[PDB]
Ligand binder design. Sequence first.
Ligand SMILES: [Cl-]
Ligand SMILES: [Cl-]
Ligand SMILES: [Cl-]
Ligand SMILES: [Cl-]
Ligand code: NA
Length: 331
Amino acid sequence: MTIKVGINGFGRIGRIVFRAAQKRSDIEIVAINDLLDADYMAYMLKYDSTHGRFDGTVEVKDGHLIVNGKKIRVTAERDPANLKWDEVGVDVVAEATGLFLTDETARKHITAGAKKVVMTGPSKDNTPMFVKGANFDKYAGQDIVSNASCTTNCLAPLAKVINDNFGIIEGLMTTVHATTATQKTVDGPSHKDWRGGRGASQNIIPSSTGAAKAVGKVLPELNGKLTGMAFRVPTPNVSVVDLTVRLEKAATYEQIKAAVKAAAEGEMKGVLGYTEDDVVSTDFNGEVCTSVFDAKAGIALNDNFVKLVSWYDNETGYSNKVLDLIAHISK
Ligand SMILES: [Cl-]
Ligand SMILES: [Cl-]
Ligand SMILES: [Cl-]
Ligand SMILES: [Cl-]
Ligand code: NA
């Protein structure tokens, strides 16, 4: 009904999740933790290069934050066991620091008073992952879950539809992805990912992403049938997937369009979108759907070998689904 949420990590996702929460009445952010002074969090919230100025009022009082007349407890604990979430009545924690993606590390929020935790990234251990449009129904009361990755949220719903209707024998996917915080402005160090340390604005950078393989986990029926890679390009936000699949049942492109459009207007409304316009990436900046099929962009070699294209706002879509998952596990 009215779920109290605590955000750990006020980075890109933390902040977009925060903004999306203002527009929902069933969820309230009541606390934020990060290694930042309240006055600086206020700044990061008020102004955003990609999504413009915060629609609302934000002031600082007594080292805490006041957003639209509500107190938000601001803390700067490095170790999550000290967060004392129960003091501000937190039901669920959105773990968004990118550092606690295992059960033992995330479990600390529960030790600190929170009832459940939602990792805003794919889990490094086998913490179960949930993707709206793919397997929310599979949630089974676990107290710690993952909302997977932004790319998986784009791919899973589309793949599910395609597979349910025509059967995916095998597929390879590519995502042309926007630049992110892990990259560098100019050629710099990235010991675990050499290419990733190259100047982001000057290059097309190949990168790895198990996101395609991870679909196998949220959609068991596709386990071992998909995999892929990514190219990081110089745009600040919004990415796109290029799924190339081989189908069991023959289907004309017109039939595929109809299948997706049906899903978008029906069962997967709000998750999977459909467009026939001449769109470009900026047209999805701010998009809430996690996957928006681009009918005109895709191409079919034949009734059984097709290349499908779907857009996604890697910050906004995912952030909204984090909230959707929080709401879902709180039923
Ligand atoms: Cl806003
Ligand atoms: Cl999983
Ligand atoms: Cl679902
Ligand atoms: Cl469901
Ligand atoms: Na709210």
